[PDB]
Amino acid sequence: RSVEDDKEGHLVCRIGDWLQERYEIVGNLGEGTFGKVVECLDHARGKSQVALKIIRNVGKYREAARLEINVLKKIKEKDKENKFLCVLMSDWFNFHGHMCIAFELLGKNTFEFLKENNFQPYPLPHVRHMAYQLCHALRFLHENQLTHTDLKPENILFVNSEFETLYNEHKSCEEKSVKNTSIRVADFGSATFDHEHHTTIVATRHYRPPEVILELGWAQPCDVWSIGCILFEYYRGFTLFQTHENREHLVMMEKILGPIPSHMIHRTRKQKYFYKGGLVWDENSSDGRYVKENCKPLKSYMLQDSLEHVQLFDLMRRMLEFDPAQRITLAEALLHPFFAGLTPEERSFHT
Ligand SMILES: COCCOc1ccc2cc1OCC(=O)N(C)CCCN(C)Cc1c[nH]c3ncnc(c13)N2
């Protein structure tokens, strides 16, 4: 049989087909703008379960996948024992122009799980365990001169997303609760070493920090901001910054977190956002009215008053510091009293 691609360059994939005389396709897991993810059995390794990312046959995506492969090689060199919760590759190949990367088979991503639960948030103890693991994984990359740059709920995955279905204590509906909150961090193709070229703009918009908007440069603190935003989303089930545009995004940041520091305003070449030393914006526009109605101070979003909620919000505010130099590092984050709530099993990574 011929190899066929669709009009967007995606491989046409058939259950029962083999690649590299080795990988038997057994299921489709998902599709995005990069290509597809499929579940395979690896017949050269005892029919082990694999997730294969199959990249579209389009030059720019091919080049981006070759970059991801080269990053993944370096990460494995630094973590040969695979102890720091990253999704590392087990093989890669070019299949008729489609780059394919083989990974361990995981559960649903944390966005998909949230969506399939009708956006009902994760319980605080789940949020706390996921937070601990994220800070752990990223702390190791940061200590090895790497920044991920594109952290978001979709590239954090449960090891196993099996769940119990419970009736909601206080609402007229059912809720899904994950049985095991062990997670892994994926998607390293944008990850950048300290010595390598830093593009002006990084991150997905909703997760993007102010220093990047203001074109002040970026480094590892970019990831901590993204983690702050992720933890809010896990806790509430909605996006902290539901924004499509820079000026709007800045206004949201001021309404939620307080004024942007004057020293950052003085330094930015993006003076279009400012007038007389303050943000300038149209309060009567569609975006202006949306932000005035919907964006409230951070502490207003707490669901309960008890100690563990107050601690989560203290940590989150520290991760969301405007000045990246002042922002909490992951090493310090791991010392925060929010993490006193972890079970021993959670703290010692025996989940
Ligand atoms: C299509 O709508 C919903 C389904 O979306 C997905 C299904 C399966 C996924 C990831 C999905 O969305 C996010 C996404 O594509 N990336 C972050 C890039 C690919 C990351 N993979 C390759 C990492 C990965 C490694 N072991 C895995 N075992 C199971 N699923 C995985 C992965 N990814």
Swiss-Prot record:
Q: GO terms for molecular function, please?
A: ATP binding; identical protein binding; protein serine kinase activity; protein serine/threonine kinase activity; protein serine/threonine/tyrosine kinase activity; protein tyrosine kinase activity; RNA binding
For binding ATP, which residues are annotated in this chain's numbering? 29-37, 53
Location of Phosphoserine modifications: 2
- Which residues constitute the catalytic centre? 150
Q: How is its activity regulated?
A: Leucettine L41 inhibits its kinase activity and affects the regulation of alternative splicing mediated by phosphorylation of SR proteins.
Q: Name one GO biological process term.
A: protein phosphorylation
Outline the extent of the Protein kinase domain. 23-339
Tissue specificity note: Endothelial cells.
What keyword terms does UniProt attach to this protein?
Answer: ATP-binding, Cytoplasm, Cytoplasmic vesicle, Kinase, Nucleotide-binding, Nucleus, Phosphoprotein, Serine/threonine-protein kinase, Transferase, Tyrosine-protein kinase
Q: What name does this protein carry?
A: Dual specificity protein kinase CLK3
Q: What gene is this protein translated from?
A: CLK3
